[PDB]
A paper describes a structure:
In humans, CYP3A4 is the major liver and intestinal P450 isoform with a large and malleable active site which can accommodate chemically diverse compounds. As a result, CYP3A4 clears the majority of administered drugs along with other foreign compounds, such as environmental pollutants, insecticides and pesticides. To further investigate the SAR of ritonavir-like inhibitors, we designed eleven (series V) analogues to test whether the further extension of the pyridyl-linker by one or two atoms would be beneficial or not.
The series V front-runner, however, was 3h (S, S). 3h (S, S), in turn, was the series V lead compound: KS and IC50 of 0.007 and 0.090 µM, respectively. Thus, the impact of the phenyl-to-naphthalene replacement in R2 depends on the side-group stereochemistry and is more pronounced when configuration is S/S. Superposition of 3e, 3f, 3h and 3i shows similar backbone curvatures, coinciding with R1–phenyls, and the R2-groups equally distant from the heme but not the pyridine moiety. Since 3f and 3h bind in a similar manner, it was not possible to deduce based on structural and experimental data why the latter analogue inhibits CYP3A4 twice as stronger. On the other hand, 5b (S, S), selectively chosen by CYP3A4 from racemic mixture, and the isosteric and equally potent 3h have notably distinct conformations: the 5b R1 inserts deeper in the P1 pocket, R2 orients vertically to the heme, and the end-moiety points away rather than toward the substrate channel. Moreover, 3h and other lead compounds most effectively prevented the H2O2-induced degradation of the heme, confirming once again that strong heme ligation and the blockage of the active site are critical for potent inhibition.
Numbering used by the authors:
A (entry chain B): 29 to 195, 199 to 259, 269 to 280, 289 to 496
B (entry chain A): 29 to 260, 267 to 280, 289 to 496
The structure:
């Protein structure tokens, strides 16, 4: 099965038996994709154990996989297990079950439902400032991942359920951060890749990848938040063909994503603003112009800030927390002049494309001017895909971009951030699996 | 009310009662703006009847009006009427209605939606050649505005609606026949003359169902969109407005279509004729552009989305022509409330005007402004170009929404034309070119040139 890419004439690194190319992951997904992007050109193929993975970089071919032939051929991502009851999650469900859940949960983030969340999110924006001011009055470096994580839990549990949780040591944030950490050193998610044919054994044994008492803590809490329109209400009205188990599976996804993804990116943004004060000061000047006298940000004033979008768009380029986009070829096809057999996982190296010298001038440097309306037209929509593309992109794309900018406005209105010497400069990404910094981001907070 | 610029200490020509300074328009808006720029300096004021108009030329002050204080102060243009149902047009809408329509029509001109239009526009690029080849196999002048208007109509009728209405011509197409007479702001007409001089007659004409656009042309386009709205195609301009309508209505939907039909036809054909006049009067520039097209597209290769953006000299030719001939001529914004921008007070109701034609030919920003020199926009020299002095498509949140589309449509046409033909003057060609001393920016005599096959 390791002679597939040799048959199709597609270049790639020589795979070892059983393992394939998984030993090259010692530097991580990101560094492995960038090396292969320079060695083999635009399209290459490697093996994740016995699973052939075809990497594509052509925007037209990326468009065909994610958009055009999505509902027909490239509908599902790479199979993940053992999951148990989490198989009904929209990010794990396949084919027919995904179509019914994609349309069911789509009205959650419309232009109207998002405008309803602005007065609700604005409450915790003051608790974020009032908690930062306690560690700001005094000269104590703030772990932004921590402070940012508590704010991300209140927003997702009030805009999706309507429950106030975080005020410190919160059981939701404590369990959500332990929900899943794909560590290739951890001998569980590793052997799943090399030996994917033992997943059927663990499913009939009621084994799961997510901790038991972390799922139970989230399974009984949704049953607790269900006592008699938001994300929760949109599903109970369709239940009265959801069940008492698929409803919990979607809440686990929304709570983890709304917490972990929002907090890590905001820490990535504040690092770049602290390492580039000319960008931070210029961004602080725009916030004071659209919102004078520290005016509360509304729904419309957020979409007006051009430079605030140019900074978030540039950070998501340097740190695409998804790293890769994957679609499973469900039947033999020939897209854009290339035959792709059934069973091959088509992969879009999002991290490798976001730093391509063929597309970006000085890609390693932080320059938010890449997304200015003068230079925005030079960006291909299939090379810069921080939220994916096609009918199966990020469902909370418009929600996350608003929720992060709602925090960046209220924080920069009152505080400026400086390095703390103990700040990791330059920031080392975790050479592990998920995209994160090695050392937690720490900065000095100075009130204005 | 004629002593506003006296009080503010802002210079300008002394206005006459009722008329104001509209008698100085006998040479057109362009020559009036140039003379005032030389007489009074960076800032001057005048009156369109009883309407004070403040002209600014400072890039920092222009940036504040168009970009910084757009949503708060300078959101709407000077009121235009009577318009009837066309009041809901994006170019005419105001305040909240314009903000809702701009966001609704923004995804129409993305880099992905435009890249989908290249194969469709590539069809009419060949029809443009075969119609020119007939007039080129026989020695005889040829009207560009004519051939260019037929091509521009097919591009807008198919990229926005998906309807092919000009099957290889069909020269007497009813769309082109009606669209050309949709509006010609002629100052000799006592109608548009009295509209600007006496503006309180607009509410009288509105209740009289009178419209500046003739009824026969509006009806022809009104019943055509209802004819095009069956749809039983991909995501285009007609599908985006229907998907959000399935809130828009069956006449705001037509109002935006009439705007897109006019701009895609009149603006594209007029600028293309200005380009070919400059290429025929500058054979070295035309040869240099022809040498670049054949280098990027050898063997007369079909133009694609990426090959168009790669041509650097083609962009310099289109940009320099837009400098000498900004069809917009002026940029106007209504100051909705009293402000003090860049240390200058502006009262509420004053229309701030940016003389785009005058700034493009300012001898203080351009060396030899009247001369046609594409090298101004070379990457060696483009750094010395202020984006608020050269504004052919406007600036800020209310710039030209079809800028990237019109730039691609004109470039796609110029490529497929220069690939097969070269252009020479005809003696009957007006050299030098006289601009229309009337309202809109057009030549006096139509541009005629001799077409030779390669
Ligand atoms: C900076 C923040 C975020 C980024 C960069 C991001 C990125 C992504 C990406 C790349 C995908 C896959 C797209 C594809 O495969 O084509 C995805 C899917 C998804 N995202 Fe996000 N995401 C973010 C935040 C969120 C949030 C706040 C939620 C809240 C519910 C969320 C929920 C989801 C779900 C449910 C899916 C799977 C949808 C499906 O498979 O149909 N994400 N996201
Ligand atoms: C050479 C071709 C063109 C030029 C030079 C041009 C130029 C301009 C300018 C200067 C403005 C006003 C900007 C401002 O006031 O700041 C404008 C507005 C506009 N243009 Fe164009 N344009 C062209 C072609 C087109 C095309 C093909 C369309 C197709 C739909 C179009 C649609 C519009 C619309 C709808 C507006 C109103 C924008 C708004 O009110 O928000 N234009 N154009
Ligand atoms: C590539 C391969 C085969 C190794 O692993 C996958 O293919 N499995 C992905 C992850 S499995 C599961 C893990 C999890 C569940 C609950 C809590 C924490 C982790 C899962 O359901 N997580 C969806 C979480 C929602 C989210 C996350 C980030 C951004 N936005 C939304 C499948 C996957 C789903 C959605 C987005 C993804 C983005 C990048 C990479 C993979 C993605
Ligand atoms: C300047 C003032 C105060 C006297 O009257 C305005 O303020 N009204 C301008 C134009 S009146 C209206 C008339 C019309 C509509 C449809 C067909 C024919 C005529 C209008 O909306 N025509 C916008 C058409 C789209 C277009 C045109 C040219 C370039 N690109 C797009 C407002 C205005 C809008 C858009 C572009 C303009 C370009 C140059 C000058 C004015 C422009």
């Amino acid at each position: 099965s390791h002679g597939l890419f040799k048959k199709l004439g597609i270049p790639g690194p020589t795979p070892l038996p059983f393992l394939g190319n998984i030993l090259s992951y010692h530097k991580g997904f990101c560094m492995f994709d960038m090396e292969c992007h320079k060695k083999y050109g635009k399209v290459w193929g490697f093996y994740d154990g016995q699973q052939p993975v075809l990497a594509i970089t052509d925007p037209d071919m990326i468009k065909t996989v994610l958009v055009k032939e999505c509902y027909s051929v490239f509908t599902n991502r790479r199979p993940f297990g053992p999951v148990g009851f989490m198989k009904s999650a929209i990010s794990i469900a396949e084919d027919e079950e995904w179509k019914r859940l994609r349309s069911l949960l789509s009205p959650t983030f419309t232009s109207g439902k998002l405008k309803e969340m602005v007065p609700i999110i604005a409450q915790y924006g003051d608790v974020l400032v009032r908690n930062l001011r306690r560690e700001a009055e005094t000269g104590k470096p703030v772990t932004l991942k921590d402070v940012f994580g508590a704010y991300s839990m209140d927003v997702i549990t009030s805009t999706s359920f309507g429950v106030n949780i975080d005020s410190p040591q919160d059981p939701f944030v404590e369990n959500t951060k332990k929900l899943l950490r794909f560590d290739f050193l951890d001998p569980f998610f590793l052997s799943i890749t090399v030996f994917p044919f033992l997943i059927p054994i663990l499913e009939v044994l009621n084994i799961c990848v997510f901790p038991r008492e972390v799922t139970n803590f989230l399974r009984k809490s949704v049953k607790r938040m269900k006592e008699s329109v938001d994300f929760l209400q949109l599903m109970i009205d369709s239940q009265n063909a959801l069940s008492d188990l698929e409803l919990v599976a979607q809440s686990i996804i929304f709570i983890f994503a709304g917490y972990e993804t929002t907090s890590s990116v905001l820490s990535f943004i504040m690092y770049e603003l602290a390492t580039h004060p000319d960008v931070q000061q210029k961004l602080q000047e725009e916030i004071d112009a659209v919102l004078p006298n520290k005016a509360p940000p509304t729904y419309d004033t957020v979409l007006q800030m051009e430079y605030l979008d140019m900074v978030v768009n540039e950070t998501l380029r340097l740190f695409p927390i998804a790293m890769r986009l994957e679609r499973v070829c469900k039947k033999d096809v020939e897209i854009n002049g290339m035959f792709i057999p059934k069973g091959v996982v088509v992969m879009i190296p999002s991290y490798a494309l976001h730093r391509d010298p063929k597309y970006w001038t000085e890609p390693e440097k932080f320059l938010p001017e890449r997304f200015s309306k003068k230079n925005k037209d030079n960006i291909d929509p299939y090379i810069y895909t921080p939220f994916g593309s096609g009918p199966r992109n990020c469902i909370g794309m418009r929600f996350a971009l608003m929720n992060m900018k709602l925090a960046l406005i209220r924080v920069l209105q009152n505080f400026s951030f400086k390095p703390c010497k103990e700040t990791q400069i330059p920031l080392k990404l975790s050479l592990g699996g998920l995209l994160q910094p090695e050392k937690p981001v720490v900065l000095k907070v100075e009130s204005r």
